[PDB]
């Protein structure tokens, strides 16, 4: 009978809500009211990167904090050198519709996808010297919204078929499949220890998955609309999700509930991309009002604004050393802020 | 030391990007949308994952993309198609059951914040099926406004009334709220659809340039 399962499911939901309320003895704002405000963080566009012909949806910094690969919808993955602004590589893609990209931790490989529903892995360390498609990972039924390398061999990718997939690049097949999401999975982020990862989807739910098992360890609710962005806290025990309800939301895994919501009345526009600084005190979030906001992760005060873009900011990422922030946009220009 | 080689590599990459820029600006991108019953498959097959078609008309290249490999949900990947010169929108004018679905989808595309600048080239296929249906299912049962509607085809004028009513519904959605709609009455077997897309894109780009050069 479906009705009894419905009753059991809503009873379990009420039990989870009651447990979260019982453990909600305080709030992050009340505890962090005594720490000094971060002040006004004025970030200037130290370097602006141009040659992308169409709007940029994807961007990922390298681990060396110098090279970054960015994907534009003209069918181009440009690997830059933000120190010198030189285009290290310009890979032409088979499918012009690219919605994600990744730079491997070793940096020998990059990845991409979008509507083609295929994760194209390209080799940047070819013996010949040119960049060619190392692999084409297919089985996704929908558009590939995000992809992140676990290492040279493994890659976890979220797609619009409401599932994620951990692939072995060498074999080219799904080592693991992650299902329970109800809507399109628009963004994921690997943990610092690269053991668990959170995926945000269009059903206003962020699911913390475990890689070695393949089952949803935790589910986080509180968002009001589609979650377009997600990133771990640098310590790995929390994450911030940006959504279409024009509010970011910081959740904690161990507490298993909302910690804080970052919003303002003047903001009525969705968040496209979210990242944390090296220490995690600043939550940089790109909005649709063509500007980004540097929220205080512990106070929620809008602690700066990055208003150098005249179109939608769709991707946003901070270097592993925290020396700079790249915020690609639909202008077709990246901008390295610092 | 290695800075010079990096500069030469950047120079080569920018030359390739300039060539790609000329190619990209030369061709015009189109987003073909419809439903399962809608005859967009025949349209894209006429001038022949994502089903792509390149067709050259009056030496202008048009790249039309039919995104059939995704799910029924399209509130996110549709944002991929704001750089398209136009959204080809295929509708079964002869299928009244699913015509309201087409109207809702057209309204959503029209009012989507990232598709506010994108003209919609509306192809009302199955005008022959619509004709035989009208001569033979009453549009009024699914559209009471048609009961009090007057015309603004050769076999009978009721077919004209029905097809222009559907056109007027779509144009009402278009005009009720920087981008225009270009409805067309096309049959399943027509060779002029490529020319229709050419003329509509000519008008769209003309209006874009007129806004650019400040005549509008």
């Amino acid at each position, epitope marked *: 009978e479906l009705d009894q399962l419905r009753q059991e499911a809503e009873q379990l*939901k009420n039990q989870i809500r009651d447990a979260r309320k019982a453990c909600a003895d305080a709030t992050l704002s009340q505890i962090t009211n005594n720490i000094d405000p971060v002040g006004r963080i004025q970030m200037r566009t130290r370097r602006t990167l141009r040659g992308h012909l169409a709007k940029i949806y994807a961007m990922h910094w390298g681990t060396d904090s110098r090279l970054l690969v960015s994907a534009s919808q003209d069918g181009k993955l440009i690997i830059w050198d933000s120190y010198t602004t030189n285009k290290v590589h310009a890979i032409p893609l088979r499918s012009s519709w690219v919605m994600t990209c990744a730079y491997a931790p070793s940096g020998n490989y990059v990845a991409c996808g979008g509507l083609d529903n295929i994760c194209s892995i390209y080799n940047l360390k070819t013996r010949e010297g040119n960049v060619r498609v190392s692999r084409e990972l297919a089985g996704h039924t929908g558009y590939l919204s995000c992809c992140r390398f676990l290492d040279d061999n493994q890659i976890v990718t979220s797609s619009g078929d409401t599932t994620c997939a951990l692939w072995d690049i060498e074999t080219g097949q799904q080592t693991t499949t992650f299902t329970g999401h109800t809507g399109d999975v628009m963004s994921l982020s690997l943990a610092p220890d690269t053991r668990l990862f959170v995926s945000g989807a269009c059903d206003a739910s962020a699911k913390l998955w475990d890689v070695r098992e393949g089952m949803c360890r935790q589910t986080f609710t509180g968002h009001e609309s589609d979650i377009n962005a997600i990133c771990f806290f640098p310590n790995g025990n929390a994450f911030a999700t940006g959504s279409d309800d024009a509010t970011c939301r910081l959740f904690d895994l161990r507490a298993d509930q909302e910690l804080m919501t970052y919003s303002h009345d003047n903001i009525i526009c*969705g968040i496209t991309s979210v990242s944390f600084s090296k220490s995690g005190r600043l939550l940089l979030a790109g909005y649709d009002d063509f500007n980004c906001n540097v929220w205080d992760a512990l106070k929620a005060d809008r602690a700066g604004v990055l208003a150098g873009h005249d179109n939608r900011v769709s991707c946003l990422g901070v270097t592993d050393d925290g020396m700079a922030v790249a915020t690609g946009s639909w202008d077709s220009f990246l901008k390295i802020w610092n | 030391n290695e800075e010079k080689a990096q500069r030469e590599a950047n120079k080569k990459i920018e030359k390739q990007l300039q060539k790609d820029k000329q190619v990209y600006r030369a061709t015009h991108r189109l987003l073909l949308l419809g439903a399962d019953n809608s005859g967009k498959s025949t349209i894209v097959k006429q001038m022949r994952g994502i089903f792509e078609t390149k067709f050259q008309v009056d030496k202008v290249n048009f790249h039309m993309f039919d995104v059939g490999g995704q*799910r029924d949900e*399209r509130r996110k990947w549709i944002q991929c198609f704001n750089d398209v010169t136009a959204i080809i929108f295929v509708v079964d004018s002869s299928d009244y059951n699913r015509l309201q679905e087409a109207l809702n989808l057209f309204k959503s595309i029209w009012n989507n914040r990232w598709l506010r600048t994108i003209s919609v080239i509306l192809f009302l296929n199955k005008q022959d099926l619509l004709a035989e249906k009208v001569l033979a299912s009453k549009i009024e049962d699914y559209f009471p406004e048609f009961a009090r509607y007057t015309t603004p085809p050769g076999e009978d004028p009721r077919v004209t009334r029905a097809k222009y009513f559907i056109r007027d519904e779509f144009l009402r959605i278009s005009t009720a709220s920087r981008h225009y709609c270009y409805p067309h009455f096309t049959c399943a077997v027509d060779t002029e659809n490529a020319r229709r897309i050419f003329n509509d894109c000519r008008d769209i780009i003309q209006r874009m340039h007129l806004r650019q050069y400040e005549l509008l």
Partner: nanobody
Amino acid sequence: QVQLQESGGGLVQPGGSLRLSCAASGFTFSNYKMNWVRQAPGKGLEWVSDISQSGASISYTGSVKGRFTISRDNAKNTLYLQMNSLKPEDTAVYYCARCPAPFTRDCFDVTSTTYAYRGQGTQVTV
């Protein structure tokens, strides 16, 4: 979490009246364009009506104009569909979809098979 509990559906004779009320929890009601949709037996999702944020703009499918009345109470945080002179063809499971994002006036994917922001629905039969 975005949750929508419909109620009111049950047996009602042809030509009768029936009130469907959806209680919405987990989101700011005033900022979303609220939709009523239906799925008949052996048929796909069919959009019935929608009402804007403030209730000023209201629209219905042509098959129910002059028969169905969609309204919203933001203060009480609920949606209503007053269904008058029911026909045999009006039998369906009625869901209360929601605009995917605010403050947009475009209701994408409301009639999708697996739309997330939709109540589980109430059966209505005559």
